[PDB]
Amino acid sequence: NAMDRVATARAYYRALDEHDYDLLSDVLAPDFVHDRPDRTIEGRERFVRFMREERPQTDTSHPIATIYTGASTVAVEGRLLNSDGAEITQFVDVFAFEDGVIGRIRTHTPE
Amino acid sequence: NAMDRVATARAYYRALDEHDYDLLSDVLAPDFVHDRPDRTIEGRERFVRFMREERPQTDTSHPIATIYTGASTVAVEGRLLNSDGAEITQFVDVFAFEDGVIGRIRTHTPE
Numbered sequence: 001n002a003m004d005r006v007a008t009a010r011a012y013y014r015a016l017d018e019h020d021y022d023l024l025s026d027v028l029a030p031d032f033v034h035d036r037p038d039r040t041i042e043g044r045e046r047f048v049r050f051m052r053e054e055r056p057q058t059d060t061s062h063p064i065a066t067i068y069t070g071a072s073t074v075a076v077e078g079r080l081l082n083s084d085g086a087e088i089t090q091f092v093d094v095f096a097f098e099d100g101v102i103g104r105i106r107t108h109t110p111e
Numbered sequence: 112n113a114m115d116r117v118a119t120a121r122a123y124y125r126a127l128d129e130h131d132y133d134l135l136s137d138v139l140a141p142d143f144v145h146d147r148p149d150r151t152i153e154g155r156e157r158f159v160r161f162m163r164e165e166r167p168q169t170d171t172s173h174p175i176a177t178i179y180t181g182a183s184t185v186a187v188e189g190r191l192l193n194s195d196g197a198e199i200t201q202f203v204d205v206f207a208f209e210d211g212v213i214g215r216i217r218t219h220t221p222e
């Protein structure tokens with residue numbers, strides 16, 4: 001269900017921005033992998049710990065610009081904002097799903 | 112090599128827009144899959160045939176707006192233009208690679 005996938009992607013960003021780790025855990029598959037240019041984190045429990053432990057390092061928001069739906073994946077184009085509301089970077093996150101929850105996110109940043 | 116991956120993604124759109132099927136074949140893995148919301152095409156030879164046979168159905172261009180690089184994939188945000196230069200749709204294509212050539216493209220269109 002494409003509506004459900006989009007809702008789940010939006011819930012992911014809500015959980016990150018609200019520090020709602022129970023919601024975050026609940027939208028991820030156990031074997032969730034997050035890829036970004038600088039690193040890969042494998043495992044839901046490991047990822048949630050990293051997010052919690054890294055919280056004080058910045059005070060950012062992930063406002064969504066446009067959501068693009070594919071056949072079975074979702075690509076979200078957003079902006080990463082600092083605490084003042086200034087744009088750090090543009091991004092595209094691509095979400096793949098496993099039984100209704102997120103199996104992988106691949107983060108891309110502009111060349 | 113991230114430079115090489117970006118060059119290869121750009122070559123894909125050049126090949127489509129120029130109808131250079133030899134270049135198109137050369138940037139794709141044999142087992143290339145193209146996913147879009149309406150259909151999936153599996154196989155390089157099959158895909159090249161579809162592109163060739165579908166050529167007369169529209170007269171579009173794939174100008175690239177922004178290229179986003181990930182750890183191992185590339186996300187291209189572009190516009191699909193008609194022959195008059197008017198925008199049909201915005202898209203994000205996500206490219207995965209296999210030995211330097213493209214293994215999969217997942218096309219996403221705005222919700």
Ligand SMILES: C[As](C)(=O)[O-]
Nearest residue numbers: 016051052054055
């Ligand atoms: C959940 As966070 C991006 O403040 O480490």
Ligand SMILES: C[As](C)(=O)[O-]
Nearest residue numbers: 127162163165166
């Ligand atoms: C290569 As075409 C998009 O004209 O079928």
Ligand SMILES: [Br-]
Nearest residue numbers: 003006007010
């Ligand atoms: Br929604």
Ligand SMILES: [Br-]
Nearest residue numbers: 010011013014
């Ligand atoms: Br929301």
Ligand SMILES: [Br-]
Nearest residue numbers: 011014020023
């Ligand atoms: Br909730």
Ligand SMILES: [Br-]
Nearest residue numbers: 034036039041
């Ligand atoms: Br991460």
Ligand SMILES: [Br-]
Nearest residue numbers: 036037038039
């Ligand atoms: Br990064």
Ligand SMILES: [Br-]
Nearest residue numbers: 038039040041
């Ligand atoms: Br890593």
Ligand SMILES: [Br-]
Nearest residue numbers: 038039040050
């Ligand atoms: Br790290």
Ligand SMILES: [Br-]
Nearest residue numbers: 040041042046
């Ligand atoms: Br890891």
Ligand SMILES: [Br-]
Nearest residue numbers: 025045048049
């Ligand atoms: Br936990």
Ligand SMILES: [Br-]
Nearest residue numbers: 048049050052
């Ligand atoms: Br934790």
Ligand SMILES: [Br-]
Nearest residue numbers: 055056057058
């Ligand atoms: Br904090």
Ligand SMILES: [Br-]
Nearest residue numbers: 062063064065
């Ligand atoms: Br938002």
Ligand SMILES: [Br-]
Nearest residue numbers: 058059082083
């Ligand atoms: Br910040």
Ligand SMILES: [Br-]
Nearest residue numbers: 001097099100
């Ligand atoms: Br799903």
